[PDB]
Design a protein around this ligand. Sequence first.
Ligand SMILES: [O-][O-]
Ligand SMILES: [Cu+2]
Ligand SMILES: [Cu+2]
Ligand SMILES: [Cu+2]
Ligand SMILES: [Cu+2]
Lengths: 544, 528
Amino acid sequence: SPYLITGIPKDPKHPLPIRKDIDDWYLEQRIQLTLFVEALTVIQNRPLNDQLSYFRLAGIHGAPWTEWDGVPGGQKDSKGNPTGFAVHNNYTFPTWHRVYVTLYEQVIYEAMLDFIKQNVPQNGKADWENEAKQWRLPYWDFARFADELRLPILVTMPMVKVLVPGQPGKQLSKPNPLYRFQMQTLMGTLERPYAITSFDLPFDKCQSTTKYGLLENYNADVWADGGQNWLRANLALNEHPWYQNLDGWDSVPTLQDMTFRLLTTGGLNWGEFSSTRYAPKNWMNLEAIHNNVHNWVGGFMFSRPGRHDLKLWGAGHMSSVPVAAYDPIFWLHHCNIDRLTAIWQTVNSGSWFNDDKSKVSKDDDLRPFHRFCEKTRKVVFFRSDDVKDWRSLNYDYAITKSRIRKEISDLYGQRTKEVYKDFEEDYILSIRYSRYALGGKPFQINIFFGDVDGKDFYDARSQNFVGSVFNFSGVLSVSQLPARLAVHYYKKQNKGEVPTPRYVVVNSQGKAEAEVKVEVALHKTEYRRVADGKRAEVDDAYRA
Amino acid sequence: SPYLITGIPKDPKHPLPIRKDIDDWYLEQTSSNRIQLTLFVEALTVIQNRPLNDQLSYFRLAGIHGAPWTEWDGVPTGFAVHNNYTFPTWHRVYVTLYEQVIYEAMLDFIKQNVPQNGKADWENEAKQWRLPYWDFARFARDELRLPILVTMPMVKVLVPQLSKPNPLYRFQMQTLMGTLERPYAITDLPFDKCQSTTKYGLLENYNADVWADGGQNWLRANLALNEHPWYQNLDGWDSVPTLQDMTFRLLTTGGLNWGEFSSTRYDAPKNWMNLEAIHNNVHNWVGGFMFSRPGRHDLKLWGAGHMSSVPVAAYDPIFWLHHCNIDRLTAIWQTVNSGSWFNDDKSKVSKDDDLRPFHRFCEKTRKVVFFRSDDVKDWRSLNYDYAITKDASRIRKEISDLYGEDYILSIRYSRYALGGKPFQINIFFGDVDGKDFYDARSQNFVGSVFNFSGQEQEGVLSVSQLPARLAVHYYKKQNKGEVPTPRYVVVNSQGKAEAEVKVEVALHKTYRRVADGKRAEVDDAYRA
Ligand SMILES: [O-][O-]
Ligand SMILES: [Cu+2]
Ligand SMILES: [Cu+2]
Ligand SMILES: [Cu+2]
Ligand SMILES: [Cu+2]
């Protein structure tokens, strides 16, 4: 039978339960924690031929590009480009992923019920079923201060203590299914047709998902499980201009600034908000922010030229669209992207596929996700209008359940406001590029104000770095970066002059790509364009 | 009981088998017939899963060294010898104990898992296997590194093929070590809140549940292991890892007596480069000892772990691989200093100390007695060897191949300067950054001395030596030829500077003292 995606079934006793912040949810805890851990462990341990195994569910998103729920799987097109179900660089990006997250949530809920049926004693039946019915997939608030932004506590824990129903007072420390996804062998040697086999990282050599764990110049057996370098990921997540590392300047995490802007800027239409797909004012979009977070969580650079004692590179699944869904944090990230969509919808209530560009895609089938159309009595694919109201999938968020503008400021606008207040003008960077510029491989666009260090053009530790744009998806693509504070620093160092944005396109070997076109400009409001960007050159040894 | 320690029994098919470099061995084993690798993985797994009342469980064998300070083998401060001249010999017997237990567990594994017609092949491999050593001072297969196998969470083994958790990656118990059953509970750093050993995994500003298993930050460990002067960070200067230089010097410098070579104990200065001091820094570099740092930092390079901590270091499986190489360095030095064995007025006293709790049978009396140092002067009597000492005629050239005006830093300190707590003495040439006085990334950093401890015997202090030739050469070039006055900072586990700690630091040149060290002030928020 087709798998009909409904969201968790509606119980009068459980009216629109909320998806909680995963750090809040964990800190308060332990039946729901036990349920989620036990259910997800079962799901991750299902066989490859079980379509509701974790592997096959993550598989929907990308590699290994197989069928799912009876829907033919993908393949490389005539361009040489892998074709799968997930939508990137198009206006259905938020709605495709809305249904995807709901699928995952529903499968977990059903495994929770099966866990209760097999493991909980009569005394505890109804309480445990009650918690299953109130549970919803937690979100990771990547833009909320945990002083700094952080990966969820639970994601950084290799083991988690759970309850043992029937043995009161007894708890067990179990492998945490949110920490990593581990298979029984290297993903490159799975049974056909499931092997993860173009990609520029050795994901065929991984048994487990990893964050920053893949580096060139280590034994290939290290890549089987490169570990969870969550401290490194937290560092990347707190990216900000380089000058803010100097004494006497305050910092603001660029991710939080971007998210505050995304949620509070008015006058965007759906097409502008929903996607990177292409007034530079309106280029700050959901998908661009989501792309940078993918990069910062997983890492995308496998190597770096030269010799470096401190090694800040390292690659991992979340930066790679074909395999990102295997990392258990993928779903928590997309749960928050769904939350951000709901928030924006709530404060932009008429802007639903409302422009001439996105209207073309409004009625796209969101394959492979089935539902029953009661009006025609047929099994059909989800469409974006079916999930316009996320509440018809029987979940909500606290923030979307009157005080939403205040809550946005309180969660994402306090630091920005505090530091900006020290300086009444805004500056932004516009960035436009082609996701195909490097034959489909990912790349990072880094922008600098002032001289670029030809051996160090990578991150917030690089002299004069201002911000990055990550080409996750591998028509054009756009993004936007805050630039106000970095321009102020530059003006201070350079007699008030406005800086020329300088950019470098960095590939997964940490080298600069000279023929990837990027259009970068600096804009000002008391927006007008005030400087045109230029490519910076790097050292000979660092040139692709 | 008693458990008689003998080394692996002699087998005429296996004359004096060598303890191999663990990276070479792992590549031999994987580079399909991985029988020795399977044997070591499976046997150490079984040993790690033995119960606490089994004195041959991993926990109890590690417990000999320090916490939780219980009996072992009927023998009622840990047993481990530190800051004394029996440091190399006590640990020689300890490593042999570990190796023999694993071998016996290998035989058990074969009896349990190998079909009858395969047993001879598998037994042949067990009998050839010896505990591999970690060559912490050899460039790994550009830089020094933790062993390949220590950095792998999972390892593929034969089923007499299958991926299994790697018992060399961590030691994991089923509960937090603070809650174990009396008397075994591990109850400074929150080691009671650990279920697993960790490298750099304990940081203060994170949820305590993170500490249950702080992970294996092996990239950070590798960075520490490659410690060298800050200036070698700059374009386009060449770098030399201090650990490799120290090791080359330890092995090639003639004229030390056993007392000088064997220990940090100080009851001149050119002779303060000793085995125990190098071993101490490696402990720090593998595990990390700083739990916190004051002030605002984007890049967080601190974090603490078991290997930096005397009472719990033996729980980390790399402990044994590190001590295997310390034993190899002893054997190399013995080979090139053959007349120097507890043979000076200082160390002679300690030679007949019983190496408790380790039992052996005396053939002269047919009694069970304790090991003494002279019983293991010849390590081959324990039926193992090292390639480098089995072929001794070339030893000088191999040492050079592997690890190879002079200026040296001398450092004399009390292990109990902070009441027994660990600390790191960092030395600088030039101005010190009052908010960054910690490592190779800190401006003008030259090198560190780690106090591996956790009051000192009257009249007893500790010494170490650091290479300084390249660092002085740089500072003079950059500073109008000025010979640098060494500046020191004594750093505690909170990343703050301990000003009420007196250390004796001095710069010597070919040796004559040419400069006296001074304590560097740091920012107020960074002062202990
Ligand atoms: O979007 O993954
Ligand atoms: Cu996606
Ligand atoms: Cu995504
Ligand atoms: Cu010891
Ligand atoms: Cu030691």
